[PDB]
Amino acid sequence: ETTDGVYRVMTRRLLGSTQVGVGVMQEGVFHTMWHVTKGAALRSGEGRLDPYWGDVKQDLVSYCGPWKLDAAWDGLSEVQLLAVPPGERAKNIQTLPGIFKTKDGDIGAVALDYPAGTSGSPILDKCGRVIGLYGNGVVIKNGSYVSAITQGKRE
């Protein structure tokens, strides 16, 4: 299966079938977070997806081709997290992102909390374009989770 869209990343290694993450298929390339697969090969029906590009520091990985997602948060408008939670249906949640101020620049951030197996779920602009992936972030002073809007570079 190589149709565009959001996918669940699953494993049969632990008890039953467990969802370890989510990813985006776009232009024949599968995009997910590095911590979801650890760079391992993926199965799609009877087919096989091999890793193509990855970076532990960016926490991103692409399969079958180079990173295709290049849309960026405009720094002003609300966005949607297309959350794909484990054992639950794909659900769109709208929010206005905060900011992660780093020594290397500002990055958009979404203040939404979901099970760990939700890592890799895409964040979208008003035209449906993927501006980044959910699942890499921090826990703030109140116990709540805040994720970066993690985007790769299209070469």
């Binding site: 299966e1 959001v6 990343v9 391992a40 799609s44 794909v84 206005l96 780093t102 020594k103 951030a109």
Partner: protein, 39 residues
Amino acid sequence: DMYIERAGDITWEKDAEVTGNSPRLDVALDESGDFSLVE
């Protein structure tokens, strides 16, 4: 062994559940890709 299963289309949906705040946080990113809070 890992596998993928399709979960839906990527579309913007009008009238979606609006939630979550917008915090401005000072963060650091280490060589291992882990974010942390700087205070």
